[PDB]
Amino acid sequence: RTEKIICRDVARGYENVPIPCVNGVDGEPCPEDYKYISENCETSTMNIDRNITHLQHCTCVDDCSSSNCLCGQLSIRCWYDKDGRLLQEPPLIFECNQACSCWRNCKNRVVQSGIKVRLQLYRTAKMGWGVRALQTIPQGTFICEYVGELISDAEADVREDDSYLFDLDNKDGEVYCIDARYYGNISRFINHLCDPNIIPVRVFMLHQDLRFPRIAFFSSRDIRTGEELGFDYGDRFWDIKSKYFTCQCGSEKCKHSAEAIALEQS
Amino acid sequence: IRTEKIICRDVARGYENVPIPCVNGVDGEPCPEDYKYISENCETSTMNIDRNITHLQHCTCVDDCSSSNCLCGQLSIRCWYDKDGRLLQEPPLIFECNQACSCWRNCKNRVVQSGIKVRLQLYRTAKMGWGVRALQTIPQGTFICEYVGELISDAEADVREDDSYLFDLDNGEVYCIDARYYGNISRFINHLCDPNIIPVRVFMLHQDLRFPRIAFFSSRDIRTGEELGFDYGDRFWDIKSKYFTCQCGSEKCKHSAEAIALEQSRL
Numbered sequence: 001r002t003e004k005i006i007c008r009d010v011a012r013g014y015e016n017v018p019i020p021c022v023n024g025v026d027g028e029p030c031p032e033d034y035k036y037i038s039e040n041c042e043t044s045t046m047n048i049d050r051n052i053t054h055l056q057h058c059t060c061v062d063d064c065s066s067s068n069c070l071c072g073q074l075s076i077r078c079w080y081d082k083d084g085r086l087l088q089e090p091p092l093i094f095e096c097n098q099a100c101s102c103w104r105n106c107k108n109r110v111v112q113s114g115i116k117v118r119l120q121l122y123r124t125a126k127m128g129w130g131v132r133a134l135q136t137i138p139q140g141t142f143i144c145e146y147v148g149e150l151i152s153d154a155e156a157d158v159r160e161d162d163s164y165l166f167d168l169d170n171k172d173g174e175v176y177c178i179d180a181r182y183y184g185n186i187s188r189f190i191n192h193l194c195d196p197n198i199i200p201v202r203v204f205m206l207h208q209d210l211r212f213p214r215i216a217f218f219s220s221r222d223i224r225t226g227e228e229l230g231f232d233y234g235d236r237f238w239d240i241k242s243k244y245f246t247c248q249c250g251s252e253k254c255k256h257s258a259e260a261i262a263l264e265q266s
Numbered sequence: 267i268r269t270e271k272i273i274c275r276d277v278a279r280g281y282e283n284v285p286i287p288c289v290n291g292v293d294g295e296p297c298p299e300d301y302k303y304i305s306e307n308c309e310t311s312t313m314n315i316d317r318n319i320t321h322l323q324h325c326t327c328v329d330d331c332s333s334s335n336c337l338c339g340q341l342s343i344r345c346w347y348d349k350d351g352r353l354l355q356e357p358p359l360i361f362e363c364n365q366a367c368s369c370w371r372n373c374k375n376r377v378v379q380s381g382i383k384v385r386l387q388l389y390r391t392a393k394m395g396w397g398v399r400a401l402q403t404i405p406q407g408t409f410i411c412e413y414v415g416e417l418i419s420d421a422e423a424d425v426r427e428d429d430s431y432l433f434d435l436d437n438g439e440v441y442c443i444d445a446r447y448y449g450n451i452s453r454f455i456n457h458l459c460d461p462n463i464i465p466v467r468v469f470m471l472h473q474d475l476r477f478p479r480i481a482f483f484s485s486r487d488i489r490t491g492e493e494l495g496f497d498y499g500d501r502f503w504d505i506k507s508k509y510f511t512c513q514c515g516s517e518k519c520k521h522s523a524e525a526i527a528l529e530q531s532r533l
């Protein structure tokens with residue numbers, strides 16, 4: 001069967017680079033049961049706090065490469081190197097923002113600068129659609145953001161389709177989620193892998209509304225061209241979904257196959 | 267004879283598509299720093315802007331939105347963009363395409379949201395403080411820049427001391443953009459009685475009608491070196507003419523000491 005190109009860019013020019021879609025496995029058409037958005041949306045009143053006078057910010061007159069940068073100090077157990085790659089309680093990134101004295105091209109601006117690597121939406125053998133790299137990707141490289149519809153945890157609890165639901169797990173305050181079922185970007189198609197090669201990290205950029213950390217994926221290891229991207233959806237997801245389907249990642253250390261679940265239960 | 271110094275390579279600190287340098291060949295005034303440069307409007311208290319994506323009117327085009335079937339183009343009042351992104355013209359109202367539209371990010375109805383494309387310079391004028399001039403030919407109808415600042419209420423505008431950077435959106439609920447403390451290059455654009463740019467109300471990523479954004483388009487071909495200016499309006503000058511008179515130098519200046527003398531003479 002020929003690998004068919006069925007969309008030049010599922011993001012319709014909204015990302016820095018196109019994200020084409022191909023299918024060399026079956027007759028499934030380009031997915032159109034959702035609306036592609038490049039940034040989070042709301043379908044009820046969220047009213048993100050964007051008061052510029054309440055942003056924590058730095059006073060750097062360099063490129064924010066020094067340890068004296070306040071924004072770097074606010075970041076929890078992680079930092080960017082000279083090439084914009086991430087090094088590591090879960091981590092938390094505070095990027096520079098419109099209140100900082102620094103320039104838009106300072107060293108603390110990786111996620112807000114968007115997608116740089118070539119990605120492809122493709123039909124997998126056993127998991128539906130998936131996302132793969134069309135280039136080599138060094139460890140620590142920003143891949144993409146988990147984008148979708150901002151909703152409350154109360155709303156998330158009553159929605160029937162949770163296959164694209166991301167829980168932000170807020171520490172202090174009410175808990176919010178990003179639901180990518182009806183509105184989402186390329187990340188909604190990233191599958192679960194028990195041997196993951198990307199990791200999600202909470203990030204603040206142009207607002208510091210603690211209800212709404214944004215979710216950035218970074219590679220956790222060097223990734224080779226053609227490799228499927230995947231992250232660990234987490235035990236909570238699988239405790240819920242396993243009664244409907246089990247993991248087909250096929251790793252030797254798969255944790256969520258029928259067999260693995262059986263072994264955990266014994 | 268004083269010669270011109272470059273005193274900042276980019277007052278926007280890399281936030282615009284192009285750098286906006288500042289020069290002074292007139293006096294010893296340093297790069298202005300009694301404000302915070304911002305490339306997009308800010309809030310210091312919430313305006314509760316409606317950003318519900320389901321409230322957006324949007325089009326179904328999969329072309330470049332150049333057809334008359336584009337709903338967004340239909341919603342635009344008494345104006346439209348040509349194939350080069352130039353504006354042609356009860357003031358006009360622009361509805362650009364948005365994230366709910368089915369079209370691509372590079373369609374023909376995205377001029378203002380795509381940002382500054384012309385080359386501008388902040389410079390020291392002889393009599394009007396800082397001003398902004400063209401560094402290139404700017405054809406008639408070309409987008410120049412947005413009037414960016416702090417979104418504030420009518421009431422808040424009333425209690426603020428300095429209104430030299432205050433723009434009334436001319437609305438329902440009444441709001442202003444105050445560029446005194448937070449603003450972009452537009453805060454430095456002076457009044458001209460022979461204006462060469464015009465402010466136009468625009469909607470882009472929201473359609474909260476209380477909060478049009480303000481886009482300047484050239485009203486004629488502008489040549490390199492020409493100072494940019496719009497008509498601030500009679501309201502501004504009714505207030506300000508007591509404190510200073512217009513220095514624009516136009517043969518038909520409406521607000522000079524000379525013009526004021528005549529008006530006070532007639533009445």
Ligand SMILES: CCCC[C@H](NC(=O)c1[nH]c2c(c1C)C(=O)CC(C)(C)C2)C(=O)Nc1ccc(OC2CCN(C)CC2)cc1
Nearest residue numbers: 090156157162163164165166167168169232233234236237
């Ligand atoms: C599709 C995205 C990947 C799975 C998702 N993972 C995460 O939310 C998550 N959150 C963090 C991570 C991850 C992976 C992290 O890694 C760290 C973090 C701090 C970013 C926090 C998840 O757990 N989703 C989910 C699905 C269903 C649920 O059931 C609820 C609501 C639906 N019905 C009604 C039953 C009740 C609950 C949750």
Ligand SMILES: CCCC[C@H](NC(=O)c1[nH]c2c(c1C)C(=O)CC(C)(C)C2)C(=O)Nc1ccc(OC2CCN(C)CC2)cc1
Nearest residue numbers: 357423424429430431432433434436465497498499501502
């Ligand atoms: C500096 C910017 C240029 C002057 C400014 N012009 C406009 O607002 C304006 N609005 C439109 C235009 C223009 C030029 C248009 O051309 C068309 C439009 C639809 C965009 C609507 C203006 O009129 N400002 C202003 C200043 C003082 C005022 O008095 C208030 C607040 C101060 N004290 C408290 C007294 C009360 C009021 C307003």
Ligand SMILES: Nc1ncnc2c1ncn2[C@@H]1O[C@H](C[C@@H](N)CC[C@H](N)C(=O)O)[C@@H](O)[C@H]1O
Nearest residue numbers: 127128129163164188189190191192247248249
């Ligand atoms: N490791 C996995 N094993 C089996 N199914 C998976 C796995 N990871 C993801 N899936 C499937 O993909 C859904 C999660 C989606 N966010 C991923 C995109 C999905 N593959 C699609 O085609 O739309 C899950 O509900 C499963 O249907």
Ligand SMILES: Nc1ncnc2c1ncn2[C@@H]1O[C@H](C[C@@H](N)CC[C@H](N)C(=O)O)[C@@H](O)[C@H]1O
Nearest residue numbers: 394395396430431453454455456457512513514
């Ligand atoms: N035509 C004019 N004649 C005299 N002064 C002007 C004129 N236009 C603008 N100004 C001055 O500029 C102020 C308006 C500002 N938005 C423009 C930038 C200002 N020139 C500055 O240096 O900051 C007015 O309050 C005046 O001080």
Ligand SMILES: [Zn+2]
Nearest residue numbers: 058060064069
């Ligand atoms: Zn810094």
Ligand SMILES: [Zn+2]
Nearest residue numbers: 064096102106
């Ligand atoms: Zn910085």
Ligand SMILES: [Zn+2]
Nearest residue numbers: 058071096100
């Ligand atoms: Zn900073």
Ligand SMILES: [Zn+2]
Nearest residue numbers: 194247249254
């Ligand atoms: Zn597995």
Ligand SMILES: [Zn+2]
Nearest residue numbers: 325327331336
């Ligand atoms: Zn259209």
Ligand SMILES: [Zn+2]
Nearest residue numbers: 331363369373
């Ligand atoms: Zn369009």
Ligand SMILES: [Zn+2]
Nearest residue numbers: 325338363367
């Ligand atoms: Zn449209």
Ligand SMILES: [Zn+2]
Nearest residue numbers: 459512514519
């Ligand atoms: Zn004049």
